[PDB]
DNA sequence: TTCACATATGTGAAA
DNA sequence: TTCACATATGTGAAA
């Protein structure tokens, strides 16, 4: 839980939490507050569950796409940065982190996936997805593979799914339209079918996850991987001479990644809103602080306009942004979570053979906008059925008490119902078939 | 799924999977068989789910406590090492992987928790738990804590619960009595009370999981932790000058850690049982084999006598075996996962204040002893209720078709039953109160 | 041991 | 939307 005068932080385990830890301790020196950094599991999941009850973090670092469902659930404090401060960060970043006309988080870094490749094994990386099967057959003879990446999270497969026209929610007339979902269209189909054919043809494994893919690339057993700027640090410490480049094209179209802005909203229930706002506006959204995080695991193209000038020279970032320009910023709306779960289920079920590609994406397209019943709605149902059983139980209690039927010492209500039926001149068969 | 010609291994994420991989690489070099080592989360829970359908890895590594349940489920191959090979391993480690008279895994190494303390920060570590609150007062004056260890897995707290008399399943007449559980006795209550009192009086934090406790000791913010030999590697790379010593006493009694034998089981569905047996007997369970794993993360006291006589020279292993002597080998019976689930919920509930100690342990006693109904018993129940509903449905089907009851276009069975009641000479109020 | 009503929620109906 | 039987399993009674 939260306690005043302390600072506990939540950020995903693939980010530079230790680098932030370094920043939190210097916040100690200036203002005296102890700041701890914890990298929990499924934090994007645990937060909307625990924050209701007061338990949770002062701050949560996460991509912006989930904050719209959060903010609409009243979990985040509205953000009040000076007009001078907004100018310090790129306007498209503030746009990503704004829901309904209120700024719910601080933009920190812009993230896009890129193709990462081993130059020693592959000095010239492929420009197309279509050439990856042939290239894998070549490298298999040398004891390598062409490409491994996280097939458990749809974030990593969406670029291929979008290339030929697959889309989540079509933005039309100034808004995202949840009636027009494109996870079921011909571009989406072709994208997934190709990914599955790669698996069918033993060029990838359906079980490959984030950890397996990183270890294979970092040890040099795979020539390529798809990942974001956070992964660069571990490749750095490895022995692999790598490059960061544009994603392969599919059917001649670019790979279209979903661009996430790593944001930071504050726990509406925190006793330290401004004692944490010191951190966020005057400590992290600063050049010298972002360096500390970026030094641990790279942040990507940070939203601070002054530090991005230095980082933008890095050819790896230029590539990251080259991919971003070809993709789209994620919507931040509430339906994102249901979209991600539906697409996650569709990829895994098609990758594993559990469902055909058509069946998987068809199921996904209906779930991408499924409404989650409200608490009151669940309580409506719960109470209605409690009433229904209470009425029946009183009927049978009375029948057993005053009926004087010829019943066994112990019997279920069906036997009572049968003895009430015959009394009313019905005959009930053994299996329930009933008639006058 | 397992494939002929390759070996996939599952080992926990805190073990030296990178060292195990190096062993795989030698196997692949002498015999030509590829070996992939993976460390997926919740692997001890994922294996029994996938292996029941013939999926899962070729070899699964875990402490021996979990294998009995795997064997009762027919998920493991029987280990058939020649007598010559069995003799190379300590008899008691073979006992740990014996189930219904058969060997169900290869023992690898003996694991026991120890007290890990920062020599510089805390010379002469405490000999009792009772002096721990006092030692935290002084240490908090220097801005440090006394003790942080994983509070989310009961493994780490069990030594204190068992100290004054808590036990899991009582051994009697040559077998563990699954009905005689000792998680509720006075000794267990005294141990969990002392632990909760540490949190109440602010000497410990209830949310502390493995990574928080590890980062704290390694960074130098706590004078002690409780952990196994796998964690020394990470401590070594840190600045900290650490010692490994006997766990403190509780109420003048030694702490009694549950002793684990890290074990390798062979999936019953693997078409590579001979290859797996060759890899385990002639590559892993060799001096060179265990050394490469051990160098990655220390294994503890290995079961192979030849390499153990070298590892025993290490004072950290002597301590670890000093704690082991005070504890007990874990049972391997299938009921062990139900005992761990119960105690896990108990410690977390008491640590958090969601339950009293007495209430949390009472519920854990009942859960740990709970007789798990068999599939057939589950099926009997399912079928019985299915039959009961079906008979009811027919009775109401017939009543609606032939009743002419003056019922609305659509109405629930309760209303049909009401109509029947009045036809038979009853009155039924709205609320179900029924009398003749 | 078997058994039966209780349980919140699921599937899908009727608007 | 609200509604209602179905769902496997829970709780606990009666041997
Ligand atoms: O896979 C669905 C998932 O995608 C994104 O998660 C990213 C995250 O944005 C990155 O910062 C990094 O942690 O990798 C994640 C994928 O493993 C979305 O942000 C997230 O909401 C969505 O569920
Ligand atoms: O916490 C319950 C847990 O205890 C043991 O797990 C140990 C494991 O033996 C060690 O090798 C190490 O990895 O730490 C684990 C605890 O997090 C039991 O072996 C396990 O079955 C049980 O659930």
């Amino acid at each position: 839980k939260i306690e005043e005068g302390k600072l506990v932080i939540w950020i995903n385990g693939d980010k530079g939490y230790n680098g932030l830890a370094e920043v939190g301790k210097k916040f100690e020196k200036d203002t005296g507050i102890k700041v701890t950094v914890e990298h929990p599991d499924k934090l994007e999941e645990k937060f909307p569950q625990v924050a209701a009850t007061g338990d949770g973090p002062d701050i949560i670092f996460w991509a912006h796409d989930r904050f719209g469902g959060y903010a609409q659930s009243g979990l985040l404090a509205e953000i009040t940065p000076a007009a001078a401060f907004q100018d310090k960060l790129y306007p498209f970043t503030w746009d990503a982190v704004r829901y309904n006309g209120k700024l719910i988080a601080y933009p920190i870094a812009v993230e896009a996936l890129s193709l990462i490749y081993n130059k020693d094994l592959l000095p010239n990386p492929p420009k197309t997805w279509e050439e990856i099967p042939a290239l894998d057959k070549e490298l298999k003879a040398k004891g390598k593979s062409a490409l491994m990446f996280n097939l458990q999270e749809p974030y990593f497969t969406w670029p291929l799914i979008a290339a030929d026209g697959g889309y989540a929610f079509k933005y039309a007339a100034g808004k995202y339209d949840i009636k027009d979902v494109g996870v079921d269209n011909a571009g989406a189909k072709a994208g997934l079918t190709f990914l599955v054919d790669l698996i069918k043809n033993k060029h990838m494994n359906a079980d490959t996850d984030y950890s397996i893919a990183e270890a294979a690339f970092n040890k040099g057993e795979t020539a390529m991987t798809i990942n974001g700027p956070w992964a660069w640090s571990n490749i750095d410490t490895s022995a692999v001479n790598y490059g960061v480049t544009v994603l392969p094209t599919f059917k001649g179209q670019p790979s279209k990644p979903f661009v996430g802005v790593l944001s930071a909203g504050i726990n509406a229930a925190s006793p330290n809103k401004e004692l944490a706002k010191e951190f966020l506006e005057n400590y992290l959204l600063t050049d010298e602080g972002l360096e500390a995080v970026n030094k641990d695991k790279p942040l990507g193209a940070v939203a601070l306009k002054s530090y991005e000038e230095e980082l933008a020279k890095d050819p790896r970032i230029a590539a990251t942004m080259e991919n971003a320009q070809k993709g789209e910023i994620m919507p931040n709306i509430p339906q994102m979570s249901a979209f991600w779960y539906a697409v996650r289920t569709a990829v895994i079920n098609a990758a594993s053979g559990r469902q055909t590609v058509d069946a998987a994406l068809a199921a996904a397209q209906t779930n991408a906008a499924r409404r989650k019943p409200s608490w009151r709605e669940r309580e409506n149902n719960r109470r209605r059925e409690r009433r229904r059983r209470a009425v029946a139980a009183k009927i049978y209690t009375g029948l057993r008490a005053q009926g004087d039927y010829n019943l066994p010492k112990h019997c279920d209500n069906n036997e009572v119902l049968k003895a009430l039926c015959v009394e009313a001149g019905w005959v009930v068969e053994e299996d329930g078939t009933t008639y006058r």
Side-chain angles (χ1 to χ4, degrees), chain A:
Chain A
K1 209 215 151 84
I2 63 78
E3 208 136 321
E4 262 171 23
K6 288 142 109 54
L7 262 185
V8 294
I9 273 177
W10 275 10
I11 190 190
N12 218 74
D14 52 11
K15 314 288 198 227
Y17 44 79
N18 281 325
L20 214 180
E22 305 191 352
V23 169
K25 218 100 164 164
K26 274 295 199 239
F27 200 47
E28 255 210 286
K29 192 183 243 143
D30 299 6
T31 61
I33 326 274
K34 196 73 90 223
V35 175
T36 61
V37 201
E38 311 163 346
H39 45 102
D41 272 334
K42 318 217 213 243
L43 77 89
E44 97 268 25
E45 269 177 32
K46 266 121 161 191
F47 171 78
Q49 301 170 7
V50 313
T53 138
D55 311 287
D58 322 318
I59 23 213
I60 51 188
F61 292 98
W62 188 269
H64 73 266
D65 66 298
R66 254 165 217 286
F67 280 63
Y70 292 4
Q72 196 215 25
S73 290
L75 284 80
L76 306 120
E78 210 200 335
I79 284 293
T80 48
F85 194 93
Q86 269 165 287
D87 296 351
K88 295 131 189 194
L89 316 182
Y90 296 103
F92 83 90
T93 61
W94 293 116
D95 210 285
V97 86
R98 154 191 298 275
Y99 181 36
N100 197 145
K102 290 78 173 311
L103 274 85
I104 315 138
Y106 295 151
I108 269 49
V110 174
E111 304 168 353
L113 289 177
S114 290
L115 189 65
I116 308 173
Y117 68 105
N118 190 321
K119 308 157 140 281
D120 311 316
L121 287 139
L122 208 59
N124 312 256
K127 309 253 191 233
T128 196
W129 282 93
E130 282 83 352
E131 65 200 325
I132 275 186
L135 173 83
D136 183 49
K137 190 216 198 111
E138 144 156 357
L139 294 167
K140 287 281 168 60
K142 281 171 256 157
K144 311 306 196 176
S145 66
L147 166 67
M148 295 183 55
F149 69 90
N150 183 5
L151 303 187
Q152 298 327 291
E153 288 286 337
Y155 184 74
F156 294 85
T157 295
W158 186 251
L160 174 55
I161 277 161
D164 202 41
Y167 62 78
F169 301 115
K170 187 167 250 317
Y171 183 104
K175 66 183 171 114
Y176 289 108
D177 180 30
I178 75 187
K179 289 204 288 311
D180 192 357
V181 81
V183 315
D184 198 25
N185 64 26
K189 266 138 180 222
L192 192 51
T193 315
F194 184 84
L195 175 78
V196 174
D197 281 348
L198 289 181
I199 305 176
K200 175 197 86 193
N201 298 310
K202 325 270 198 133
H203 303 291
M204 295 199 315
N205 269 60
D207 305 309
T208 296
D209 63 19
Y210 190 90
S211 176
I212 295 164
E214 188 170 23
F217 184 86
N218 283 355
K219 302 176 133 98
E221 317 174 295
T222 210
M224 289 175 294
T225 188
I226 289 164
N227 213 333
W230 52 89
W232 296 338
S233 266
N234 297 352
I235 330 178
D236 274 351
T237 93
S238 98
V240 177
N241 199 2
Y242 67 100
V244 200
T245 208
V246 174
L247 293 180
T249 62
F250 182 57
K251 283 155 116 216
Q253 286 102 307
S255 268
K256 273 128 200 146
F258 254 148
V259 200
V261 195
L262 178 72
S263 315
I266 13 211
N267 214 327
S270 189
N272 316 319
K273 313 210 156 142
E274 314 235 14
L275 186 87
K277 286 199 38 164
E278 278 332 291
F279 202 74
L280 252 50
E281 269 193 25
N282 264 86
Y283 266 83
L284 187 54
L285 279 194
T286 85
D287 309 69
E288 191 113 352
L290 303 172
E291 180 168 32
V293 160
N294 199 57
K295 205 158 217 137
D296 189 351
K297 267 72 200 133
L299 277 184
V302 313
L304 192 53
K305 258 190 230 178
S306 77
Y307 192 48
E308 177 56 359
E309 286 238 287
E310 166 159 39
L311 293 191
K313 302 192 221 171
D314 184 323
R316 287 172 321 173
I317 288 304
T320 293
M321 293 326 313
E322 184 165 352
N323 274 297
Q325 188 279 329
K326 272 172 215 298
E328 271 170 27
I329 37 68
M330 291 184 267
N332 68 1
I333 60 179
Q335 294 97 328
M336 265 318 91
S337 71
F339 158 84
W340 281 125
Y341 286 124
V343 163
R344 176 185 218 276
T345 306
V347 168
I348 287 167
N349 280 355
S352 74
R354 264 179 285 236
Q355 280 181 313
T356 55
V357 153
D358 279 357
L361 289 191
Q365 167 133 310
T366 75
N367 291 350
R370 172 148 54 167
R371 320 111 194 109
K372 209 175 177 254
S374 81
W375 182 95
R376 178 57 63 189
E377 213 174 319
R378 283 271 189 257
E379 181 77 356
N380 287 349
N381 300 344
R382 193 191 67 83
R383 284 178 198 188
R384 180 177 313 110
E385 298 325 285
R386 163 165 177 298
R387 209 172 307 134
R388 180 186 320 296
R389 272 120 44 176
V391 157
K394 257 158 279 157
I395 292 183
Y396 288 114
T397 293
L399 289 165
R400 295 170 173 276
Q402 292 196 0
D404 219 280
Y405 305 123
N406 273 31
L407 305 158
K409 184 184 157 19
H410 295 275
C411 66
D412 58 24
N413 285 336
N414 279 354
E415 283 293 309
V416 164
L417 169 57
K418 286 200 218 209
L420 168 69
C421 280
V422 312
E423 168 151 287
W426 304 75
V427 183
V428 180
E429 272 199 29
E430 173 83 332
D431 70 343
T433 323
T434 286
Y435 43 73
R436 272 159 181 306

